[model samples]
Target: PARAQALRIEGQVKVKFDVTPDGRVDNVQILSAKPANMFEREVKNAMRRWRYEPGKPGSGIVVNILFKINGTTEIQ
Candidate 1:
């Protein structure tokens, strides 16, 4: 995730996901990436561990992301 910070990335991304009725993120697809840079891997890592409340239809946890990095962050 720190990789993007050094690049000062600023953009939006769209992703499609699938979740069990129990709210566990299962599948993920990068629908669109503004610059198609470092956010993909970072987003994937962040999403895999997350859980969401089940919505209607019992599937399809579609989501998007906005990365705004105007400063530096420590990388460890």
Candidate 2:
């Protein structure tokens, strides 16, 4: 993250992962990314901590993470 910030790199990463019945995330995969592998590591790291409502386990959960630097870094 600091490397990207220092380099002023802005990009987005599309990730796919699965959620367990206990609301835990796993099986993270990178579907797509702008500027190549720049943001994949960070995205996967965050996704690993993601949680959902406790219920049926879900697969193929896709999400897009936007990394932008405007005065300070913002993640969405």
Candidate 3:
């Protein structure tokens, strides 16, 4: 997400999050992805740091993350 690697995928990603009673993310699978599974690793890493309603516990929510690779020079 912060840097580029050997293999780069230029597109968008969508993720749906589910919150569990123990403040855990449940079944954070990919809902929509462009250019194959390019955004797979990036999405997982970012979603891990997110903390849902801790005391609320059993609450569930869905979030979408978009990753677009503009170009080699400037990101559009």
Cα lDDT for residue 14, model 1? 61
> Stretches of candidate 3 above 4 Å error?
1-38, 73-76
Model 2 stretches with alpha carbons more than 4 Å out: 1-6, 33-76
Of candidate 3, the 10-residue stretch with the lowest lDDT total is 2-11
TM-score of each: 0.34, 0.36, 0.33
RMSD per model, one decimal: 20.3, 20.2, 19.2
lDDT of 1 at 9: 31
Worst 10 residues of 1 by lDDT: 1-10
lDDT of 2 by residue, 16-48 (tens): 899999999999998764555665565565556
Task: List, residue by residue over 1-76, the lDDT tens digit for candidate 3.
Answer: 5532233344455668899999999989776645565557766655676655467766365555545566342444
Model 1: per-residue Cα lDDT over 16-66, one tens digit each = 899899989888998765555566666665666665446634556565555
lDDT of 3: 0.59
Clashing pairs in 3: none
lDDT of 1: 0.57
Write out the backbone clash pairs for model 1.
none
* Distance from true location, Cα of 2 in model 1, Å: 21
lDDT by candidate, in order shown: 0.57, 0.60, 0.59
Best by lDDT: 2
Clashes of each: 0, 0, 0
